[PDB]
């Protein structure tokens, strides 16, 4: 509930950006706060304010700050694919992710340090977020399957390589091989057995952290596994 805001400073003697956001006009950022809250990577979500480093914040659900769910979704997508689940953990990626989050909350960049490689970093993030909307060709379908008999289901949308986890009820085995979902169900399987193919396996509730009038900080956890799913109608006979 009550959490201290920690930081790691990114300072290379470089003006990272010259930006404007709300009342804050033509502000030069010559260092960057990489925020942590209780071990977890956080982002500033009010680009016109300074954060209260070292102070006790109160955690509340992200919806207290932002009503619009599509925005809340997008902010968690950018956090997730941009940095937390990204292969590149560099200071530059963190900054790019923070900067992209800030673009959605009204920040405008007049100057950007060329060494960020910002446009290329941003583009790869938006591609990852857009691809996460795509679902398998068998998404939401019901398919009959006899107990014992191994079934194969082809995803003609070419999305199964993005699957990070598989949930199945007891008595159902489900594996991925290329664009094929390989399935077998036994007598312990329920009559309608749903397989979930998750894109995200570190799902949680996104929190906003507030200390006084200082900058609000988000632990922007994705709250949806973004699964393609398929329901098997298990034939007992
Ligand atoms: Zn320094
Ligand atoms: Zn400074």
Residue numbers in the entry: 4 to 240
Question: What do the study's own words say?
Answer:
An increasing number of surface‐associated proteins identified in Gram‐positive bacteria are characterized by intramolecular cross‐links in structurally conserved thioester, isopeptide, and ester domains (TIE proteins). TEDs are predicted at the distal end of a large number of surface proteins from Gram‐positive bacteria, and the name TIE (thioester, isopeptide, ester) proteins have been introduced for this family. Internal thioester bonds, formed between Cys and Gln side‐chains and first identified in the second thioester domain (TED) of the Streptococcus pyogenes minor pilin Cpa,3 play a negligible role in protein stability, but are suggested to mediate covalent bacterial adhesion. Structures of Bacillus anthracis, vancomycin‐resistant Staphylococcus aureus, and vancomycin‐resistant Enterococcus faecium TEDs show a head domain with Class I topology extended by a β‐sandwich; the latter contributes the thioester bond‐forming Gln via a β‐hairpin insertion into the head domain.
